[PDB]
Amino acid sequence: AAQTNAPWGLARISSTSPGTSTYYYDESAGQGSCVYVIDTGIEASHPEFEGRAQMVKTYYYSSRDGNGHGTHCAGTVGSRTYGVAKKTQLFGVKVLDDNGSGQYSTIIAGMDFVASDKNNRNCPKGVVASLSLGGGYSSSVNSAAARLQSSGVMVAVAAGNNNADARNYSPASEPSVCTVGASDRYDRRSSFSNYGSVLDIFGPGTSILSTWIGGSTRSISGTSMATPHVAGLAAYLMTLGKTTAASACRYIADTANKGDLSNIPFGTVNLLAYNNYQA
């Protein structure tokens, strides 16, 4: 299946070259899989989710995404027009306030929730978690994402927008989860994107058009925009039975466009998430 005039990031993860506009994907489109969007919430009422989004837990007074960041990343995961896995289930876990900030105790509690809450859901194709967030290095945040990963959840996290080595940032530095860096529409590393040995993959993360709060759209940037591209891909590749939750980070790296990225500092992988769809 094809989506014409797609967002550049959608077209990128279906191409071996930048500059294209069509997103080529398998029609199953992540049906039967779930992606937990651990963020500021989701505006599930957005017509771009078609009722496939729902809030499952908040850590604040409302489950309303009064920020927009979470609705954006849920959109990049599985929105109709701006998403990778266009048929996936979306579960919102509001751990970030409407300012997009959140304490470590709340973020860890959110990952522990998803680890157990997934046993209440029907995700036959497997469970994915997209963690577009992160602060300074913490062993407690790192071990939480490892716990979530170990429990059978494909955990994808942002490398961080500090333009430094990601080793000093959590959950980015947790070795067992998929740390996602950001590139731009010209196959360069994003100006802001973190790097390092811990990074496992790069995703489209500069000028990402996706859903926003108020039924609108918005184009923003960040490794927080690249992470849902990879989370949606992993959910897509799991519906196809191409990989599993424990392997999906390795599979996506094994099948990524190697070497296309420029300005990748020495020691960081040079891989761009790629669904390898052949009509």
- Give one DSSP letter per residue of 130-152, joined into a string: EE---EE--HHHHHHHHHHHHTT
Beta strands per DSSP E along 41-140: 53-58, 89-94, 126-131, 135-136
Is 10 buried (19+), middle (13-18) or exposed (0-12) by CB count in 10 A? buried
Give the other-Cβ count within 10 Å of 146's Cβ. Answer: 17
Say whether 221 sits in a helix, a strand or coil.
coil
Phi, psi torsion values for 228, nearest 5 degrees:
-65, -30
Q: Which helix (H) or strand (E) holds 252?
A: helix 248-254
Say whether 38 sits in a helix, a strand or coil.
strand
Structure-block tokens of residue 151: 């429990």
CA angle 175, 109, 73 (to 5 degrees): 70
The domain tally of the chain equals 1
Does 16 count as an annotated binding residue? yes
Which residues are part of the catalytic machinery?
A: 39, 69, 224
What is the crossing angle of helices 223-239 and 69-78, to 10°? Answer: 30
Does 177 count as an annotated binding residue? yes
Cβ(222)–Cβ(182) below 8 Å? yes
Cβ neighbours of residue 210 closer than 8 Å, sequence gap 6 or more: 7, 72, 73, 75, 76, 79, 82, 83, 217, 218, 219, 225, 228
Cβ(161)–Cβ(193) below 8 Å? yes
Residue 212: CATH number of its domain: 3.40.50.200
Does 175 count as an annotated binding residue? yes
Q: What is the resolution of this structure in A?
A: 2.2
Nearest to 200 by CA among 141, 238, 149, 140: 149
Say whether 45 sits in a helix, a strand or coil.
coil
CA dihedral 209, 215, 216, 221 (to 10 degrees): -40
Does 260 count as an annotated binding residue? yes
**What domain range is 214 assigned to?**
1-279
